[PDB]
Symmetry: C2
Subunit: 131 residues, 2 copies
């Protein structure tokens, strides 16, 4: 997963609001989240991968090992069970909570970092590029 | 995943034939497979986990890292894409091939090693115990 290492700036966002609405994000915070242009900083240290997101909305940080389930408090304050795998060359994270389930795909496409968030059909696409 | 390390003997098997039939295993080999009492030998060396199965049917060996997709030629000669994770304290392996998908769960239940194989509803249960 050395292809993901680095600092990335958000450059585009599509259907994010629809996605947040689906996960059950409140109207107010949903707008504050949408106006944010985060700086995802992926890093690795041994078998531990760390994805740090810095936004005007909320700074989050998750450190994990691949294929090993972990606990996470999402930005929208959901308490979920996560597991990240390197599937088909892409960092595939699936979040399970209250019987519900969302998947977050992080894949490289040229010089871009494409993030696909899926929740019951709805798909949000956010593209990043090296800062 | 140190709870899985060791040598294990098969002690029981339920609905295995139904499971094999579902994955598309031929009648003849399906019977030869069912008459086998394999010795699953799980081992670890650093970040590499190796599951060695020894049977009168066919000796298979897979070495892998958790959360990292790998190529595997199953005992019944299927060429699949596998990914093993430590989900909910259990070694959860999912095999993808030709649009189809089977999942193999390996969990500890007391002094036993329970293997649950699922393929479109059908579930096979094989219990092992330290040799």
């Amino acid at each position: 997963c050395d292809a993901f290492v680095g600092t990335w700036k958000l450059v585009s966002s599509e259907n994010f609001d629809d996605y947040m609405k689906e996960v059950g994000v409140g109207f107010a915070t949903r707008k504050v989240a949408g106006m944010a242009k985060p700086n995802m900083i992926i890093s690795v240290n041994g078998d531990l991968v760390t994805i740090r997101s810095e936004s005007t909305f909320k700074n989050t940080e998750i450190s994990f090992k691949l294929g090993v389930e972990f606990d996470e408090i999402t930005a929208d304050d959901r308490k979920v069970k996560s597991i990240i795998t390197l599937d088909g060359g892409a960092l595939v994270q699936v979040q399970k909570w209250d019987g519900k389930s969302t998947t977050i795909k992080r894949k490289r496409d040229g010089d871009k970092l494409v993030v696909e968030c899926v929740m019951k059909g709805v798909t949000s696409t956010r593209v990043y590029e090296r800062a």
